[PDB]
Amino acid sequence: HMTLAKVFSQKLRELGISSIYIGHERPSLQSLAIKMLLKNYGLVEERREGMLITQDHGIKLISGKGTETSRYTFRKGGKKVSIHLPEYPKMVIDLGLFEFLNEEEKEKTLLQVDLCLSVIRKFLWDGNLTVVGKADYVLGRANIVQSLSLSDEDNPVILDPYGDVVATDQILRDHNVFVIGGSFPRVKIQLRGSIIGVPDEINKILEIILRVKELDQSLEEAIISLQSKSDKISRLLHDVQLYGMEVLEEEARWLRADDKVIEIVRSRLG
Ligand SMILES: Nc1ncnc2c1ncn2[C@@H]1O[C@H](CSCC[C@H](N)C(=O)O)[C@@H](O)[C@H]1O
């Protein structure tokens, strides 16, 4: 779809603005826009000089002292830019069954939901995240609702590792609402025919989907980038039981698996 950084940059050019003095802020449009949306930060109209730090989506981000010309500086208290924030995608986490679980289980689930905020703010913004079915929960500007209300422009899918619809670049790309649990299609992410090795963690699933949608990355590469040592180990082990040792070496270069992983997988066999 569109990242917050991209929408921000298109509005900025329209007005006529292609340089910002950022002073002491992380020099990324995403970060700057998030900050503007969440704090009293904004743009102040002032003429300043600097050197380039970067050229994000075509906008010269300035600081320090040099010879690059800013007409606008990003400052605590400046004026907001007004940007049609992307309605989509909407990432929904369902906490319906939440009080089936153990105390220790609830603390793990919620820690995982907490980390979603950081993922959502890496591409979109808090508004694109919704949590359903727990009303005392508060996660920055996430929507916190008791039940999910569907609109005509919503085209949703349920992420379910026991689903009957295998996920695909196109299927993730052609949908815009995604429900991840604590009557639409129930969609299962596999690695290469299998669910084994696929990260289990709510915040990792969410990040896999966004990588595919916002960065134009493949599902395979997305999954692999987000695996833990344990995901790789468990998958190599499985596949060596299946296909034998000839598989090990090459399937480790593909899983991008490091020495420690391969060491361990050897050590389990002999
Ligand atoms: N490989 C995968 N494919 C699709 N969805 C997944 C997935 N791994 C995790 N999820 C999502 O992450 C949530 C937490 S995993 C626990 C749910 C598990 N299906 C169960 O029945 O116990 C799941 O409900 C699912 O929404």
Side-chain angles (χ1 to χ4, degrees):
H1 265 135
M2 300 175 289
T3 71
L4 185 56
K6 188 151 154 173
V7 189
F8 190 15
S9 72
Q10 290 171 294
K11 186 52 80 163
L12 280 168
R13 269 168 274 159
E14 288 199 69
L15 285 137
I17 303 185
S18 295
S19 295
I20 304 169
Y21 195 102
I22 57 162
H24 277 228
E25 313 276 320
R26 282 201 180 160
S28 137
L29 267 168
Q30 267 281 345
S31 64
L32 285 164
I34 292 290
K35 233 213 180 164
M36 195 174 72
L37 292 176
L38 289 167
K39 301 208 186 122
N40 197 1
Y41 277 76
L43 289 183
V44 158
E45 193 189 6
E46 66 170 4
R47 280 219 163 80
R48 296 201 53 182
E49 286 202 18
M51 73 172 314
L52 273 189
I53 288 77
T54 44
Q55 175 112 73
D56 190 342
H57 300 111
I59 285 143
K60 239 172 293 183
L61 267 44
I62 298 310
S63 207
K65 182 67 76 62
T67 59
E68 286 278 11
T69 58
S70 171
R71 304 196 309 283
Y72 291 84
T73 291
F74 177 98
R75 225 169 180 195
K76 183 178 179 180
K79 182 174 122 154
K80 311 253 157 214
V81 177
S82 178
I83 294 169
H84 187 64
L85 301 171
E87 187 181 343
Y88 294 107
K90 291 176 182 156
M91 314 300 282
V92 176
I93 297 122
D94 194 332
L95 292 188
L97 317 146
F98 183 75
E99 306 234 81
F100 269 108
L101 320 185
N102 186 340
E103 202 32 83
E104 293 177 350
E105 281 174 316
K106 288 147 95 103
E107 173 86 353
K108 267 174 214 188
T109 307
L110 282 186
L111 286 163
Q112 271 180 38
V113 182
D114 296 336
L115 290 169
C116 288
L117 190 61
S118 192
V119 172
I120 209 70
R121 281 189 193 179
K122 207 170 293 137
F123 296 97
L124 314 160
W125 96 288
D126 309 17
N128 292 86
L129 178 65
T130 300
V131 179
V132 174
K134 186 185 161 41
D136 62 332
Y137 192 65
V138 184
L139 183 54
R141 299 264 187 189
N143 301 287
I144 304 307
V145 311
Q146 176 48 29
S147 174
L148 173 67
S149 71
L150 286 327
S151 112
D152 281 339
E153 235 168 62
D154 289 333
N155 181 27
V157 175
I158 306 150
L159 288 164
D160 176 10
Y162 296 104
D164 51 342
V165 174
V166 168
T168 299
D169 277 36
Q170 222 41 65
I171 287 159
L172 304 179
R173 286 219 265 270
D174 298 329
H175 296 82
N176 68 5
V177 173
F178 297 89
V179 181
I180 303 173
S183 63
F184 296 95
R186 284 157 44 192
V187 165
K188 167 210 285 176
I189 300 166
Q190 290 176 338
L191 192 38
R192 268 216 207 132
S194 177
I195 283 306
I196 302 300
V198 178
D200 210 12
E201 288 82 63
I202 292 167
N203 60 302
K204 281 176 177 194
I205 289 294
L206 164 48
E207 184 161 10
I208 291 158
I209 289 158
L210 289 183
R211 278 174 164 245
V212 171
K213 289 192 67 47
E214 302 299 334
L215 278 197
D216 277 325
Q217 255 198 25
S218 173
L219 177 55
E220 191 160 273
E221 183 65 13
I223 285 170
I224 278 164
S225 178
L226 283 164
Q227 281 176 318
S228 71
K229 271 167 206 267
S230 315
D231 295 326
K232 295 190 205 282
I233 287 160
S234 178
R235 173 53 155 170
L236 296 188
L237 215 70
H238 178 248
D239 281 17
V240 162
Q241 293 177 335
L242 261 157
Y243 309 116
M245 300 275 197
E246 246 180 323
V247 153
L248 171 65
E249 189 182 79
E250 161 74 354
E251 188 155 330
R253 201 192 313 310
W254 160 63
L255 294 180
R256 265 197 249 246
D258 66 1
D259 288 328
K260 291 147 183 244
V261 167
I262 300 145
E263 270 161 341
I264 295 157
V265 163
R266 292 201 183 142
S267 78
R268 289 287 287 101
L269 308 158

